Design a protein around this ligand. Sequence first.
Ligand SMILES: [Ac+3]
Length: 174
Amino acid sequence: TSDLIPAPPLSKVPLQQNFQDNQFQGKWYVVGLAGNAILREDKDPQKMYATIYELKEDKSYNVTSVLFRKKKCDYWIRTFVPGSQPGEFTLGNIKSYPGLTSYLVRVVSTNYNQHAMVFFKKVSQNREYFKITLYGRTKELTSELKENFIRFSKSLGLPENHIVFPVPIDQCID
Ligand SMILES: [Ac+3]
């Protein structure tokens, strides 16, 4: 048994105009995280993690995420394959992820050198999950970019308790 806020229609999710795949590369901090499986946990607050985007020769991304868990750095690797339009991706080698039938990435907005908002949607065990990440080139962003991210998350049907601001750390992500 699982009850989820429904994924929004893709029509409610803007695409960054004239996306530049080369400028999106490098390290992003996860400064904000919202979604239908994200819950605030005042007990054990979510620690910031980082995601590195590297363009391969075929223009897919190697996407490496690093998080600090159980006193160690945990790495996870994804391939993002260019999809229907610049700034949209599907997941490479979906067969290797048990239960995963669908995975979509849309870059909603970025200025490449400070911030980005990225929409993800997937179907895993026939359940439809979506999330939005607010990416920072640094571990802090303005109140203005954070409130913009809260506004965008709420427009997609998420309440406040499905919106978190991971806490800055130094381990693994520097
Ligand atoms: Ac995922």
